[PDB]
Amino acid sequence: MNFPNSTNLPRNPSMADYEARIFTFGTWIYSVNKEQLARAGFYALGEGDKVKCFHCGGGLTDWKPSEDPWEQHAKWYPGCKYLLEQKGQEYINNIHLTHSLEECLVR
Numbered sequence: 001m002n003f004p005n006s007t008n009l010p011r012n013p014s015m016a017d018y019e020a021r022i023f024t025f026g027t028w029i030y031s032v033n034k035e036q037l038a039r040a041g042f043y044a045l046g047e048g049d050k051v052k053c054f055h056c057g058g059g060l061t062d063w064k065p066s067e068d069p070w071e072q073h074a075k076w077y078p079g080c081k082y083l084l085e086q087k088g089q090e091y092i093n094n095i096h097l098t099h100s101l102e103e104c105l106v107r
């Protein structure tokens with residue numbers, strides 16, 4: 001499904017600015033907040049609630065009310081350098097431990 005970009009160089013430079021990302025959404029009806037999405041590096045593709053990160057290229061869909069943009073970014077795209085820059089590895093480990101341990105309690 002395309003490998004995730006793990007370099008310090010964004011895959012989509014045209015979407016590097018917060019403002020550029022914000023425009024891609026338009027009127028947004030979805031449970032997840034467009035400005036929180038833009039902040040977490042995401043821009044809309046115009047395919048329902050599908051977003052992609054400008055940096056890693058990582059795509060995410062089918063946002064539940066309980067699914068946080070930053071947490072999901074870490075969950076599915078842990079190699080993203082934008083994520084590492086913004087949140088730190090301390091945060092990233094926490095999220096990973098949290099989700100890895102969320103699996104324990106469900107089974």
Ligand SMILES: COC[C@H]1C[NH2+][C@H](C)CN1CC(=O)N1CC(C)(C)c2cnc(Cl)cc21
Pocket residue numbers: 001050059060061062063064067072076
């Ligand atoms: C459909 O999976 C579950 C949802 C649930 N809602 C959150 C926000 C995100 N979740 C992951 C996701 O959407 N994934 C993961 C992966 C890596 C399989 C992938 C690849 N491409 C695209 Cl477009 C999307 C996508």
Ligand SMILES: [Zn+2]
Pocket residue numbers: 041053054055056057058073077080081082083
């Ligand atoms: Zn990313």
